[PDB]
Every structure is written in C-alpha cells, then in structure tokens.
C-alpha cells in the first residue's frame, strides 16, 4: 500500500436511533391522522444482501418505543378539539332500566337560567356508574380524572401505516422462517420503507395482523423468568366474528353553551345479550399445535387455566368493533384444557362506555354510542400468556392467559426490523499515489 | 427448572479469620443476610455488583456456575444466616459462627 485512497458509497452501517415518519396508502378525519401521512410508493424496493449476517434483538429495539410514544400523542391531539364532559357528575338518581346490565335514569343539571334546574334522562351501563352509598349512583371516573368524550367525526378503523426511514438510513429485516426472537439471522434484506402495520389494540388474543408460515413461533425475553410475558405467533388464522344484536338510538343532551353530550338515548327492540362465537374444532386443535411447540421448549406436561384475576381490562379479552369497546371472558377457551363436528363456542360478554385505555396518571375518556347493530370479523394470530410456576412440579407447568404493557402487542409485528445508520465513507490501501 | 445446592449445611469459623460460602446455581444469584426475626437485606446482585448500604469487606465473585462470597476479619453483628436467592427458589442458609 503506502498510499491512502478514499472510497465514497461503500456498504458500511452501524446501529443508531432516528425519528421515522408515517406513510399511508390511498374525506373523514381519522384518530391516527393519516391525512398527513405521505403517499406510499407504488412498489417499494426490496434489495437483498446475500453473504452478510447480522444479529438484532426486538426487546432492545427502539422502533417499538417510538411507536408507543407517538400513538399516545395522536389520541391526545384527537381529543383536544371536541368538548370535555365535566358537568355530568351529580347525584344520579337511578333505580333500574325498564328494558343488572343497563340502567335508565336522569340527572339534574342546568344549561342556562342559573337559578333553574331541569332534568334530562340518559341510559348508562351498570358498570359505568358505581353506587354512591340506595338507588343513588355516580359516574365512575370523575374523582380521579376529567372525562372527555371522543369527537363524533373521527373514526376508530385501524388502517395500515408504514414507518418509513429517512434518507441516508436503512432498515434491516430477515425472514429466517422459524426466525428466533433473538440471535443472528443469515438472510437479511434491506428495505428502504417498511410495510403496512395495523395499530390494533387488544389485551389477551392478538387480532387481525400478519401471520407466519409453517411455524408456531414463540417469543419472550427469557423463558425462565416469570414476569416476562410469552408472545405466541400462529401460522393458522382462526377467524373470530361477532356482533351486538341490540339496537341503539342516538340522542343529544345539552350540557352548556356550544357543548353537546351524546347519550345512549332509547332502546328499540327486544334486549339481546351481546356475545361472541368461535369455531370449536378449529380452536381446539389450534391450542394443541401450540402445546406441542411449548412441550419441547419446556420438556414438561402443559395445562391451560383461566386468568387468575385483576382489573376488567386485563382479565377479559378487549378490542374495538366499529367504535364500540368490548370486554369478554374468554374463560371457556383456557379452562382445564390439558392436551395429553359443527359445535361452536359462544362467549357471552358485555360492553363498557367509559374506558381507561392507555393506562397512565389521571386520564379518562368517553366513547359516544352508535345507532344500529354492528358486525365485525377478525383473525386470531397470537396469544399473550403469563406462565404460572413455583418449580419442583412433576410436569404440570400451568399457563394462564393474561396481558401486559401495550408495546407487547406491536412487538409481534415488528419482531424483524432494525433501523441503522449508513456511513458511506471508506479508506483502503492502494498504490495509486495520486499524480 | 433452575437448580441449586448447599453442600456444607453447617459453618464454623473463629472471628478475625477468612470464611467463605458458595452456592452452585444457574441463572442470576443474590445473597442476603437475615437477623433473628427480621427481614433480609441485599448484599450483591448479578453475583458481583455491590448494593448500597452494605459495609465494605463484603464482596462476591463468580467462577462458572459457582458463586463466591468472601467474608473476612469478622466483627460482631456479622453473624447471619446467609442464603442464595434464585428467582423463586431460596435454600436454607447457615448461621456463621460466634
């Protein structure tokens, strides 16, 4: 050598963290505010590297951390314009509903005419209002935080969003097909712009979302540890579809100058308890396939038992169905199911109006009702379980479905990504000796 | 199925000498000392790192699957029942001496 030369545009990269922007594919405002997302490319590049191997871990990945922060901000932005339901916590004289699940009653509140009081009737669910003492109730969450109703215009439909890296940066992914959660993968391809991700919210059974191929991938921070949750990923889509047969009726209630509060109004039609149904034979064998995968990872006999208990948001499967927030048992699926027809498993459950989602300090939110029955299908593509163990157990290693921090939902779909900085400057030895 | 053992089960050493205790176990190991009727306290975590508030002369070392805890120049109040703490597994300790 003995003479230096500089090369521009060489394949060198090193780990780094950087902000990423959104992108949407293809009239009505969205909670995700996708109208600001730039249009997606017609055909994203999928360059593939052949003789390079890289290792990365999703648990320490910063991509999931950034997503969790911005999603919170979007909901904060969404609820800012529309009004907040502060003037509704009074002595709610509620006795019963003519049509222990639905309560019909009225609250004595004033709109104008300061020295005047006029009542208005509204319908609330039993769990929405807590007893104050007999025949006296009160709004649940207004001794801890202010309730704000979701703006009627926006919609909760989750559409795919691409977190697309900036210029001068690359995102590395590998499809190892039985890709382990952590460790080196020898088939890495550089994609400039990620693919569609659906911001879905759930607590027990991950829904919609992408699937795997010829595998049942089990991912967790550490198998031995108990606190760490286990994320199962299924290659088979077990469809789950259900409706709310009851018929609502929208109604507007004045609360102040230019402020409107939409209540449940009047119930029309016979009452029919909501429920969700799931195929029996399809689900029964689905857990058996998962059980076989868990048998080798643990070597011991496995039994599924229902969740121990806790808050209603973690002990019951939850999701969004056309602006209605559900909370269902899912107790018949994971009870006494030791694994070593047209029957369908029905899962009766009820609805909640005020939801404490995005668990944080002093923050609530109210979901306005929607008129008419709602139907929504969905795909089950992963179970979130928390292993119950004290050791010294002849096999009998019990697994209990549960939940956890919200980021665990998205880690199952971001499990192969790494945003990396690119350094195209290179110095090598050569006998040039520039003239 | 993390496992551990306590070979000696009985420890005796005169004051002012060097005495050691070992707990062969897999995974992370933590050492605690328990007075009579009171709660334990943490000496070291991850096998080597020292907790704040534990007086000097208490340190630990790791060699493969075995963990070293070195105790030297004994003075009063140091008598304790030392045990190794795996995630959800604790084995009985041993009163040091007096």
């Amino acid at each position: 050598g003995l003479w230096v030369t500089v090369y521009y545009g060489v394949p060198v990269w090193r780990e780094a963290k950087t902000t990423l922007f959104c992108a949407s594919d293809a009239e009505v405002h969205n909670v995700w505010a996708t109208h600001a997302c730039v249009p997606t490319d017609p055909n994203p590049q999928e360059l593939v590297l052949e003789n390079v191997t890289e290792n990365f871990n999703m648990w320490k990945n910063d991509m999931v951390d950034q997503m969790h922060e911005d999603i919170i901000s979007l909901w904060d932005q969404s609820l800012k314009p529309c009004v907040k339901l502060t003037p509704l916590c009074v002595t709610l004289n509620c006795s019963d509903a003519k049509v222990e699940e639905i309560k019909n009653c009225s609250f004595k509140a004033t709109t104008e005419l300061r020295d005047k009081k006029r009542r208005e009737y509204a319908l609330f669910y039993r769990l929405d209002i807590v007893p104050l003492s007999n025949s006296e109730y009160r709004l649940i969450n207004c001794n801890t935080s202010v309730i704000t109703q979701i703006c009627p215009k926006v919609t909760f439909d989750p559409i795919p969003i691409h977190y697309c890296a900036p210029a001068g940066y690359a995102i590395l992914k590998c499809n190892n097909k039985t890709f382990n959660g952590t460790g080196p993968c020898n088939n890495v391809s550089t994609v400039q712009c990620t693919h569609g991700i659906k911001p879905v919210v759930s607590t027990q059974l991950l829904l919609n979302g992408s699937l795997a191929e010829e595998e049942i991938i089990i991912r967790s921070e550490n198998l031995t540890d108990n606190v760490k949750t286990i994320i199962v990923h299924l290659n088979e889509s077990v469809e789950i579809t259900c409706t709310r047969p009851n018929n609502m009726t929208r109604k507007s209630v004045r609360i102040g100058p230019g402020q409107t509060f939409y209540a449940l109004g009047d119930i029309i039609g016979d009452i029919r308890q909501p429920h969700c149904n799931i195929s029996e034979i399809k689900w029964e064998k689905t857990l058996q396939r998962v059980s076989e995968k868990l048998r080798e990872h643990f070597n011991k006999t496995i039994i599924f038992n229902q969740s121990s208990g806790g808050d209603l948001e973690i002990t019951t499967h939850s999701f969004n169905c056309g602006g209605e927030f559900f909370y269902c048992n899912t107790s018949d699926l994971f009870f006494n199911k030791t694994f070593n027809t047209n029957s369908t498993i029905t899962l009766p459950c009820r609805i909640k109006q005020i939801i404490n989602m995005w668990q944080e300090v002093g923050r609530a939110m109210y979901a306005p009702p929607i008129a008419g029955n709602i139907t929504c299908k969905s795909n089950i593509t992963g179970l979130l379980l928390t292993r119950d163990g004290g050791g010294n157990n002849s096999t009998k290693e019990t697994f209990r479905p549960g939940g956890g921090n919200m980021r665990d939902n998205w880690r199952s779909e971001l499990y192969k990504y790494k945003v990396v900085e690119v350094k195209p400057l290179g110095i090598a030895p050569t006998e040039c000796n520039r003239t | 199925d993390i496992q551990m053992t306590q070979s000696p089960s009985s420890l005796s050493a005169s004051v002012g000498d060097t005495v050691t205790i070992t707990c062969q176990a897999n995974g992370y190991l933590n050492w605690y000392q328990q007075r009579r009727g009171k709660a334990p306290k943490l000496l070291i975590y991850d096998g080597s790192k020292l907790e704040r508030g534990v007086p000097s002369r208490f340190s630990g070392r790791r060699w493969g699957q075995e963990y070293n805890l070195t105790i030297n120049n004994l003075q009063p109040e140091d008598i304790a029942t030392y045990f190794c703490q795996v995630y959800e597994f604790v084995v009985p300790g041993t009163r040091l001496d007096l």
Partner: nanobody
Amino acid sequence: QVQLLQSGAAVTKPGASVRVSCEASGYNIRDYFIHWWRQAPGQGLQWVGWINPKTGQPNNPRQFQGRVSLTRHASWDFDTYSFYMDLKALRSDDTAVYFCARQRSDYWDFDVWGSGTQVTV
C-alpha cells in the same frame, strides 16, 4: 424507597381468613413489581407470588393457587399504594411470617422489605 411498612400481628382459628396489608409511599409504585414471601419456623424462605401494580395481575404457585388472592387498592393520590394478601383455607403448617418485597429490575433482587406479620393457627 422511604418505607414499606406492613400490618400488625394477627391470630386466626382454622378455617378463618387473614388479611395482611403492605403500603409503599416513597418510590413510584406503578413501575416496580411487588412480591410476597413466607417463612415457617426452622425453614428457609418461601414464595407466594407477585402482583403487578399497573394492572392487578397476580401469579402464585400451584400449592397456593385457589387459596391466596393478591389485591392492590391505590389511594386517591398516586402514592401510598396499598397491597393486600388474603387467604381462605388454613392449615396447621401455615404458621409463618409473611414479608413484603419489591423487584427492582430484570435482576430478581429485593432491597426494601417490610417488618413482618406473624400469623398462627
């Protein structure tokens, strides 16, 4: 990490129920897990379970499953979180002292412990 005071001593006849309360004020309770330990006379420590302060999700061994129930009741302010531990059935070997611990990080280490609550039968 100012204090982790526990309830007082109590005695209950067989078949009764015993309540033990653990309170934490100093540190942020919504960030670190809480574990419960047991120690019968003339024996080493024993594990009862852990409860997540964020969402009240318990986790207990097989032997204590169906008997112990861990509950958390935050005060009006997000401080002085109260952690409870209730059991239904009693046995002659349940005579022990129960402590209140705290998990710091991925490393299962505990630096703050409660005084203790001896319970007999």
